[PDB]
Design a protein around this ligand. Structure first.
Ligand SMILES: O=C(O[C@H]1[C@H](OP(=O)(O)O[C@@H]2[C@@H](O)[C@@H](O)CO[C@H]2O)[C@@H](CO)O[C@@]1(CO)O[C@H]1O[C@H](CO)[C@H](O)[C@@H](O)[C@H]1O)c1ccccc1
Length: 490
């Protein structure tokens, strides 16, 4: 088998699966670990966007009541060190101690904020485990299929601790750990004892190449087989090669810009809203994304299923209202910084440069502050910054509630003083089954989000990869790379 070499835009700081949640972690952690329930993005000839859920580490599952799901596990599954997977490892993965309890915050900072209102799991036998919530939750199934739910080995994890585990991970996945050189590379090797489809590459290397031009040059020179995070602008040039091609797809994620609302200038919604109203998204999508990116109608996406609102109007663009809001605000003309880690996000810098011109027309001076990986300053030295959110559930709960809710980082760390009505609705949607009340509450939350502007949604990016034609691999509609039944050579 050939070794697979990947040129990437970044690497996570840890291989602990929850801590690795980002645009750069899942493409690695998806190889090392498995979940109880998995997604088959290729079901019924779908071009990597199928919503179909399939058994993975759990052979079957059944909802027992409004707050519990019982799982029957695959038998004789081995972690990379030969230890058999049991309900003990599954219970530990979803425990108060490791994930959501008070004693877990130090090791997994976002564990509690991203988790459901869990109750301690119940081990029925070696291969049977019930995952449950303290209050009703119809989200257990989607949570278990998500990036929050990769299964860790209890004994090995406890022995090492979360920090050391993140540097030497052990999972049940098709590829096993070889090396992790901080801010440089990750090397994995084929796990030939894998329970599912046998790995088709002998090794996988993820090498950071921060500059996209240098990344493209690496593919051309033959240093990489696949490269990530390109722009629709690179398409014509790569495709002009007989042996190279681009492969892209819209992903279930949105790019945005956000604010440090602890800062005096951003304490009030007025300037935040003015900045949002001046963003001409169609011109950015046309010029930088070649119409391949999509602009959502608010914090509202098709993957939400029953909680997606297809009748929702597009987000308002109003330069004249933006001009009035700036005039009425306390803003003087002082430059406002916008922090960006080069092009960690595809089109981060060209998008920002277009927005700086748009904002100059409304009387707001915004200045780009580009920083290197590991150079993100303390919070009080930041004003505006870019971000993204992967829409990780088949429900509107994610990411409006875990990120922007009362228990989330936007309110707790970034100082968004959310209206009381918003937090009340966040609590309601957590416990309610689908219906008119729940559907209407998400719409009211979307209206408040647009009015308050704690963040400004830009678009769903069109994720662009480039590969050698002799490397058969299709992208999926999520911020990760899938190699199961989706990687072959020659
Ligand atoms: O830029 C990355 O993370 C990004 C991550 O944002 P992503 O858009 O990639 O991932 C989001 C998630 O945050 C979550 O909302 C779910 O959906 C996902 O798409 C996030 C957490 O790792 O912090 C970020 C924000 O720009 O970064 C910010 O916070 C870190 C602080 O330790 C960085 O080191 C800083 O440089 C700084 O830029 C990153 C780069 C290298 C190592 C680790 C993370």
């Amino acid at each position: 088998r050939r070794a697979l070499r990947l040129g990437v835009n970044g690497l996570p700081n840890s291989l602990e699966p929850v801590n690795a949640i980002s645009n750069v972690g899942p493409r690695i952690v998806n190889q090392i670990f498995d979940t109880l329930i998995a997604r088959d993005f290729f079901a019924k000839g779908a071009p990597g966007n199928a919503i179909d859920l399939v058994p993975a580490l759990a052979e079957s599952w059944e909802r027992i009541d409004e707050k519990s799901v019982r799982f029957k596990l695959r038998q004789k599954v081995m972690f990379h060190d030969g230890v058999e997977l049991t309900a003990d490892d599954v219970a530990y993965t979803f425990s108060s101690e490791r994930l959501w309890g008070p004693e877990a915050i130090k090791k997994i900072p976002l564990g509690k904020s991203y988790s459901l209102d869990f109750d301690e799991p119940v081990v029925e036998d070696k291969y049977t485990v019930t995952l449950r919530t303290k209050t009703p939750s119809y989200l257990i199934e989607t949570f278990v299929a998500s990036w929050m739910s990769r299964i860790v080995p209890k004994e090995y994890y406890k022995k090492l601790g979360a920090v050391d585990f993140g540097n030497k991970p052990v999972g049940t996945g098709p590829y096993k750990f070889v090396e992790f050189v901080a801010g440089d590379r990750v090397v994995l090797e084929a796990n030939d004892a894998y329970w599912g489809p046998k790995p088709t590459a002998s090794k996988i290397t993820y090498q950071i190449v921060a500059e996209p031009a240098t990344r493209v040059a690496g593919l051309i020179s033959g240093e990489y087989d696949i490269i990530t995070t390109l722009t629709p602008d690179d398409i014509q040039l790569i495709n002009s090669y007989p042996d190279l091609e681009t492969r892209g797809t819209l992903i279930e994620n949105f790019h945005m810009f956000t604010f440090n609302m602890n800062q005096e200038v951003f304490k009030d919604k007025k300037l935040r809203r003015a900045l949002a109203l001046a963003v001409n998204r169609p011109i950015m999508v046309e010029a930088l994304w070649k119409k391949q990116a999509s602009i959502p109608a608010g914090f509202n996406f098709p993957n939400y299923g029953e909680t997606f609102d297809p009748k929702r109007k597009a987000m308002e663009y109003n330069v004249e209202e933006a001009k009035r809001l700036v005039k009425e605000s306390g803003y003087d003309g002082t430059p406002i910084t916008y922090h960006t880690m080069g092009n960690y996000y595809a089109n981060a810098m060209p998008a920002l440069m277009m927005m700086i011109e748009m904002w100059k027309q409304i009387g707001v001076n915004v200045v780009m502050k580009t920083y290197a990986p590991g150079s993100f300053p303390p919070d009080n030295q930041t004003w505006m910054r870019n971000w993204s959110n992967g829409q990780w559930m088949t429900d509107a709960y994610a990411t409006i509630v875990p990120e922007f809710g009362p228990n989330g980082q936007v309110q707790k760390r970034w100082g968004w003083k959310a209206p009381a009505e918003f937090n009340e609705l966040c609590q309601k949607v957590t416990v309610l089954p689908n219906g008119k009340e729940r559907f209407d509450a998400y719409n009211r939350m979307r209206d408040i989000f647009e009015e308050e502007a704690p963040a400004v949604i830009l678009y769903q990016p069109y994720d662009v990869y480039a590969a050698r034609k002799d490397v058969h691999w299709k992208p999926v509609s999520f911020e990760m790379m899938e190699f199961r039944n989706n990687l072959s050579f020659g």
